[PDB]
């Protein structure tokens with residue numbers, strides 16, 4: 001029975017290696033990674049791989065691994081797929097822990113923009129969770145700890161993390177993680193999966209996919225929002241993505257809205273993430 005070596009980047013940056021039978025469905029490898037992680041609330045999470053165009057794709061747990069990674073290496077990352085709108089409602093602390101690790105990477109990467117003060121407050125919760133109570137013996141007038149807190153570090157930011165870390169004395173790891181989550185969940189780009197597209201006029205937009213629905217970022221003044229209940233049908237054809245908006249009260253007909261994606265694969269990828277968010281956040 002021929003088995004393939006899988007390599008999985010974990011949220012703490014370490015690399016987990018295992019083997020699955022070469023005809024294995026994605027779920028088999030996902031089960032192995034979740035059991036390694038002692039994670040029971042698996043529904044929020046998934047594995048990503050890079051396609052032949054070097055684009056991040058969700059590994060479909062229901063499909064053969066080989067028919068998705070195709071000609072590519074069996075290298076994956078473990079990631080948050082569905083960001084819970086209210087992480088306080090998750091049943092386990094370890095679930096909230098993995099969600100915190102993902103968000104820290106969202107922040108450092110710049111995918112989750114964040115004000116100076118929120119960067120410092122999130123960092124201060126991370127430090128409290130991992131070091132415990134502020135100790136000055138690990139803090140002088142020039143201290144720059146190993147934690148990555150931001151896409152661009154400054155001494156001012158490092159200073160503010162420590163000022164706030166002093167205020168958290170006696171905070172337990174589960175407690176600091178929950179505070180981290182109560183601030184992060186409020187950020188305007190929390191859990192937003194962004195896709196480059198063009199509107200029906202050719203103007204470059206971003207389509208955001210999140211729990212509350214589909215977001216259309218035209219400019220800073222022009223931001224359309226479509227709540228999931230208002231979307232009856234999501235489709236793609238060629239490089240085009242369409243959503244069928246529900247008829248408003250007393251309106252005779254549905255309206256269709258169309259976008260141009262970079263290529264056919266980008267159109268299919270956005271279609272599949274929309275259906276999955278629509279399904280997930282309809283049931284949650």
Ligand SMILES: Clc1snnc1CN1CCOCC1
Pocket residue numbers: 048056079080106111112189190191192193194
């Ligand atoms: Cl959604 C959302 S909010 N910030 N990032 C994302 C996209 N993730 C980030 C890494 O894992 C797979 C893709």
